[PDB]
């Protein structure tokens, strides 16, 4: 997050690896549920 590479985004970035041990179909339900496709277009708050 702007000269950091050690912020909260990086905190879970590691453990996040566990996400790979989850059904690909289930993840799709949660993704399309909120529609992260547009949430990745803009972020600032």
Partner 1 sequence: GSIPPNALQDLLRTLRSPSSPQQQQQVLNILKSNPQLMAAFIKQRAAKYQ
Q: Is the dihedral of CA 33, 39, 40, 45 positive or negative?
A: negative
Quick check: helix, strand or coil at residue 43? coil
Q: What is the dihedral of CA 12, 17, 19, 24, to 10 degrees?
A: 140
- Kindly state the smallest distance separating residue 30's Cβ from partner 1, in Å: 4
Contact set for partner 1, span 1-45 (CB under 8 A): 1, 4, 6-13, 15-17, 19-20, 24-31, 33-34, 36, 39-40, 43-45
- Judged by the rule CB under 8 A, the positions of this chain that interact with partner 1 are 1, 4, 6-13, 15-17, 19-20, 24-31, 33-34, 36, 39-40, 43-45
């Amino acid at each position: 997050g702007s000269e950091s590479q050690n912020d909260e985004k990086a905190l879970l970035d590691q453990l996040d690896s566990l996400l790979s041990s989850t059904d690909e179909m289930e993840l799709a339900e949660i993704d399309r549920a909120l529609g992260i496709d547009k949430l990745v277009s803009q972020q600032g708050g």
